[PDB]
């Protein structure tokens, strides 16, 4: 029934270069497909590429977003506003537990407008957000 888009923010191209981004993406696509949905993804170190991808999603039939903004979590109001502009619900994912880290990482420009948040559960957090999204879509 639906289309999901997974967005990965900056530096995540280095993951497991220990699970890689490619491994995460293939597992998500597989699980989405088994449940009858279509899943797309993009990683970028460029804020504008992520913004543009979100704008495209509005005009392409995307029903739900799963985003790991990574360092942009704490900085990119522009990505927050892209999500809000297109009115596509999303779940925020973080690999590491930000509460264990520097105070600046405790603030997110996403969390208050996300459906929910998964933090600190490593690469598995993405598939957990996908389980949630599949329910949210019914």
């Amino acid at each position: 029934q639906g289309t999901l888009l997974v967005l990965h923010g900056p530096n995540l191209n280095l993951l497991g270069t220990s699970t890689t981004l490619g491994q995460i993406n293939q597992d998500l696509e597989r699980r989405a497909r088994e449940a009858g949905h279509h899943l797309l993804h993009l990683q970028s170190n460029a804020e504008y590429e992520l913004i543009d991808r979100i704008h495209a999603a509005r005009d392409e039939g995307v029903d739900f977003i799963i985003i790991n903004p990574a360092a942009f979590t704490h900085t990119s109001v522009a990505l927050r506003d892209a999500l809000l502009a297109v009115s596509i619900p999303f779940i925020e994912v973080h690999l590491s537990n930000v509460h264990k880290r520097e105070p600046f990482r405790h603030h997110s420009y996403f969390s208050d407008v996300a459906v929910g948040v998964i933090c600190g559960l490593g690469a598995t957090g993405y598939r957990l957000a996908l389980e949630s999204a599949l329910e949210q879509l019914q």
Side-chain angles (χ1 to χ4, degrees):
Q1 45 179 96
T3 300
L4 302 104
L5 170 60
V6 186
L7 296 173
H8 299 113
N11 308 118
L12 297 174
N13 51 295
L14 299 176
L15 273 179
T17 71
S18 226
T19 305
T20 66
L21 216 44
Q23 289 177 305
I24 293 164
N25 284 151
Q26 169 184 258
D27 186 66
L28 298 178
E29 281 172 343
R30 176 185 66 74
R31 295 177 181 271
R33 193 167 45 238
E34 285 168 6
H37 297 98
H38 181 216
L39 183 147
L40 299 162
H41 55 81
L42 175 64
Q43 189 271 333
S44 184
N45 300 135
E47 184 185 42
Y48 80 85
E49 187 176 5
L50 297 167
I51 294 167
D52 285 343
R53 184 74 182 82
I54 290 159
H55 290 181
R58 185 192 75 164
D59 300 325
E60 302 162 352
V62 169
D63 303 293
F64 206 96
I65 286 164
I66 297 168
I67 187 173
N68 181 350
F72 294 161
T73 298
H74 319 301
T75 65
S76 185
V77 176
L79 278 164
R80 172 202 184 91
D81 287 353
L83 296 167
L84 289 174
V86 306
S87 314
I88 291 165
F90 71 90
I91 291 163
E92 180 188 3
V93 173
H94 296 289
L95 298 165
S96 78
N97 183 340
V98 304
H99 306 286
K100 297 193 164 166
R101 306 182 71 184
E102 298 85 356
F104 71 81
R105 296 191 196 273
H106 305 176
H107 172 256
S108 173
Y109 283 119
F110 299 81
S111 303
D112 58 313
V113 293
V115 180
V117 191
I118 301 177
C119 132
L121 304 185
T124 286
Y126 288 98
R127 85 177 166 80
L128 300 179
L130 180 56
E131 295 302 320
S132 177
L134 298 180
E135 172 188 293
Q136 299 283 321
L137 284 175
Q138 306 312 139

